[PDB]
Amino acid sequence: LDAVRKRPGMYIGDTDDGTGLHHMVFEVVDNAIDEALAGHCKEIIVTIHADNSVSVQDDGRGIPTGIHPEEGVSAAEVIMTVLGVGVSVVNALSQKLELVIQREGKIHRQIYEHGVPQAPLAVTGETEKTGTMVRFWPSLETFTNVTEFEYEILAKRLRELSFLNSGVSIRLRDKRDGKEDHFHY
Ligand SMILES: Nc1nc2ccccc2[nH]1
Ligand SMILES: N#Cc1ccccc1O
């Protein structure tokens, strides 16, 4: 990930005018849509939190948790840390990122800071549900001037995605002012 950290703009887009900041969400959403497509209920929830973080939840199968035989860490950590630019870029450029995977009857959690895992992916509980959730706090060392998410920019893109990925439900929620949308074709 040091190649990303060296020139963030070349991977995510302009880090001063809001372009890159919003692209962070769209990259995560791309992965969440793929996950939702492979499951039964086919829904994603994008939430803008009051503290300027964003979470993306899917109801897919959960991304794989087993150890990657080459890399020697969880397959989930490989997705988050090894170079559509990929969600590893989002991770590298987030001051904090929380991953939650529900899969094979277990809840798994991991925290990253600036792309660095704070501990290995760990089982924290049992669950009947399946899916993946990522919440990320964009790094204010990287993203300047426009540091807050504009609802309308997210809504515009998610609407476009709902037509293309027809039969995937996309919910957008803003916890700052209560605004919400439900895109479903
Ligand atoms: N604040 C801060 N920025 C970082 C960038 C890369 C790795 C660790 C870091 N801690
Ligand atoms: N959110 C989300 C997500 C789903 C699958 C793989 C990576 C992700 O960041």
From Swiss-Prot:
When the enzyme transiently cleaves DNA a phosphotyrosine bond is formed between GyrA and DNA in an ATP-independent manner. In the presence of quinolones this intermediate can be trapped and is used as an indicator of drug toxicity. ATP binds at D58, G84, V85, G86, V87. Signal peptide: none annotated. It comes from the Bacteria. The gene is gyrB. It comes from Escherichia coli (strain K12). Heterotetramer, composed of two GyrA and two GyrB chains. In the heterotetramer, GyrA contains the active site tyrosine that forms a transient covalent intermediate with the DNA, while GyrB binds cofactors and catalyzes ATP hydrolysis. The active site is at E27. Belongs to the type II topoisomerase family. DNA gyrase negatively supercoils closed circular double-stranded DNA in an ATP-dependent manner to maintain chromosomes in an underwound state. This makes better substrates for topoisomerase 4 (ParC and ParE) which is the main enzyme that unlinks newly replicated chromosomes in E.coli. Gyrase catalyzes the interconversion of other topological isomers of double-stranded DNA rings, including catenanes. Relaxes negatively supercoiled DNA in an ATP-independent manner. Changing R103 to C/H/S: Resistance to coumarin antibiotics, decreased ATPase and DNA supercoiling. K(+) binds at I79, V82, G84, S88. It is found in: Cytoplasm. Consists of 3 domains; the ATPase domain (residues 1-220), the transducer domain (221-392) and the toprim domain (393-804). ATP-binding is cooperative, and both subunits must be wild-type at residue 103 for supercoiling to occur. Non-hydrolyzable ATP analogs (and ATP-binding) induce dimerization and enhance ATPase activity. ATP hydrolysis induces domain shifts that are probably part of the mechanism of DNA cleavage and rejoining. ADP binds at N31. Residues 1-185 are annotated as: ATPase domain. This is DNA gyrase subunit B.
